[PDB]
Scaffold this active site. Structure first.
Site, PDB file in Angstrom:
ATOM      1  N   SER A  53      -7.611  43.741  40.740  1.00 33.42           N
ATOM      2  CA  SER A  53      -7.326  44.768  41.746  1.00 33.42           C
ATOM      3  C   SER A  53      -7.895  46.107  41.282  1.00 33.42           C
ATOM      4  CB  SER A  53      -5.821  44.850  41.997  1.00 33.42           C
ATOM      5  OG  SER A  53      -5.468  45.939  42.798  1.00 33.42           O
ATOM      6  N   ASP A  74       1.543  25.826  45.575  1.00 35.02           N
ATOM      7  CA  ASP A  74       1.551  26.722  44.392  1.00 35.02           C
ATOM      8  C   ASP A  74       0.120  26.959  43.912  1.00 35.02           C
ATOM      9  OD1 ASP A  74       2.102  28.143  42.081  1.00 35.02           O
ATOM     10  OD2 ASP A  74       2.841  26.378  40.987  1.00 35.02           O
TER      11      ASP A  74
HETATM   12  C1  LIG Z   1      12.473  26.037  40.358  1.00 35.35           C
HETATM   13  S1  LIG Z   1      11.619  26.947  41.591  1.00 35.35           S
HETATM   14  O1  LIG Z   1      12.247  28.234  41.732  1.00 35.35           O
HETATM   15  O2  LIG Z   1      11.493  26.127  42.762  1.00 35.35           O
HETATM   16  C2  LIG Z   1      10.003  27.196  40.917  1.00 35.35           C
HETATM   17  C3  LIG Z   1       8.893  27.012  41.724  1.00 35.35           C
HETATM   18  C4  LIG Z   1       7.648  27.388  41.256  1.00 35.35           C
HETATM   19  C5  LIG Z   1       7.491  27.944  39.995  1.00 35.35           C
HETATM   20  C6  LIG Z   1       6.157  28.494  39.559  1.00 35.35           C
HETATM   21  N1  LIG Z   1       6.158  29.945  39.423  1.00 35.35           N
HETATM   22  C7  LIG Z   1       6.315  30.565  38.227  1.00 35.35           C
HETATM   23  O3  LIG Z   1       6.562  29.947  37.190  1.00 35.35           O
HETATM   24  N2  LIG Z   1       6.194  31.911  38.245  1.00 35.35           N
HETATM   25  C8  LIG Z   1       6.292  32.711  37.027  1.00 35.35           C
HETATM   26  C9  LIG Z   1       6.874  34.095  37.265  1.00 35.35           C
HETATM   27  C10 LIG Z   1       8.328  34.081  37.744  1.00 35.35           C
HETATM   28  C11 LIG Z   1       9.117  34.145  36.457  1.00 35.35           C
HETATM   29  O4  LIG Z   1       8.203  34.381  35.384  1.00 35.35           O
HETATM   30  C12 LIG Z   1       6.996  34.847  35.958  1.00 35.35           C
HETATM   31  C13 LIG Z   1       8.615  28.110  39.201  1.00 35.35           C
HETATM   32  C14 LIG Z   1       9.870  27.738  39.650  1.00 35.35           C
END
Ligand SMILES: CS(=O)(=O)c1ccc(CNC(=O)NC[C@H]2CCOC2)cc1
Length: 330
Positions: free
Chosen positions: A199, A35
């Protein structure tokens, strides 16, 4: 030193990617979500509330001869999707693709939110944003990349995500066979702890390129491409029957549609996201309404170049004294 590991989509939609990581002695291999939008390496563990574990592989520090409790240290993180996890901290030996860090902070989950429990394929996260976002208290810890950096042949890692296919994370070198043309480098702000860049604009399908500055983060831990509402409206206006649905929580489109490509600027260069990359399939099993891969950032507070965008490129995360990002076509 260098490391090289294969990253594999967790499902048929590329909702996320998992990369095997060796933790401890003897090695315990966990499949972690790399991540670039967070800075904690945390795992499901022998300490995780039993009711919150459902098929994940766990790290058991008591079985690692190199594990040390980091006394008094705790961590607690909340992600942009509303998910969360918290626990305590060990140091241990962590290897990715042949590259080994000793004394890495391994954040052991005592609690995880429902979305983590419900995803049997992700055993934890390996954060690759800047260590200033690390949540460990009272002593903030370094990311795996920050700990490895000085040992690497070059202070870089690269993300080469696949569309419906495995890809690669490399540490310490740039595989010149993995991309076409040249890598265009662009400035990074670390002020929010992210790989934040600007960008130079976008195009929809075969449309003319719009020159406009779009500040956002390169985030391998976010599935979709989140951009300003003006840009997203211009994209979905080119798809017959596409609409923003408040009930579903974003733009949906007829599953019968052929989607146009989306191009984003990196300096004078252009990265083209094929239309198929923007299809996230039925909103519910058997629906003819499909979820779009390009969504508004208006409710987030930041634009996010997530996997939909990054998987169209070979991406260099350059951790030199002045960090930069590089993008190449592939
Ligand atoms: C539980 S899981 O699906 O494995 C997961 C993995 C990684 C994150 C990190 N990414 C993140 O928070 N992205 C934020 C974006 C998507 C929504 O709001 C904006 C969150 C959740």
């Amino acid at each position: 030193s260098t490391g090289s590991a294969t990253t594999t989509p967790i499902d048929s939609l590329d909702d996320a990617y998992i990369t095997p990581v060796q933790i401890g002695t003897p090695a315990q291999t966990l499949n972690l979500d790399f991540d670039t939008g967070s800075s904690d390496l945390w795992v499901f563990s022998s300490e995780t509330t039993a009711s919150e574990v459902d098929g994940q592989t766990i790290y058991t520090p008591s079985k690692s001869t190199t594990a040390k409790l980091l006394s008094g240290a705790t961590w607690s993180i909340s992600y942009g999707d509303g998910s969360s996890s918290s626990g305590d901290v060990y140091t241990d030996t962590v290897s990715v693709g042949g590259l080994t860090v000793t004394g890495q902070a391994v954040e052991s989950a005592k609690k995880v939110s429902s979305s983590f429990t419900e995803d049997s394929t992700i055993d934890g996260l390996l954060g690759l944003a800047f260590s200033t976002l690390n949540t460990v208290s009272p002593t903030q810890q370094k990311t795996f990349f920050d700990n490895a950096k000085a040992s690497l042949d070059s202070p870089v890692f690269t993300a080469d995500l696949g569309y419906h296919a495995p890809g690669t994370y490399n540490f310490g070198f740039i595989d010149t066979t993995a991309y076409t043309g040249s890598i265009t480098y662009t400035a990074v702000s670390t002020k929010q702890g992210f790989w934040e860049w600007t960008s130079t604009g976008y195009a929809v399908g075969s449309g003319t390129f719009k020159s406009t500055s779009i500040d956002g983060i390169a985030d391998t831990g976010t599935t979709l491409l989140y951009l300003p509402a003006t840009v997203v409206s211009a994209y979905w206006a080119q798809v017959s029957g596409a609409k923003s649905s408040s009930s579903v929580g974003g733009y949906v489109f007829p599953c019968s549609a052929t989607l146009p490509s989306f191009t984003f600027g990196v300096g004078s260069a252009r990265i083209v996201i094929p239309g198929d990359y923007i299809d996230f399939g039925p909103i519910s099993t058997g629906s003819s309404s499909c979820f779009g891969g390009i969504q508004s950032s208006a409710g987030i507070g930041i634009n996010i170049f997530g996997d939909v965008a990054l998987k169209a490129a070979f991406v260099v995360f350059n951790g030199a004294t002045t960090p930069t990002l590089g993008f190449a076509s592939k």
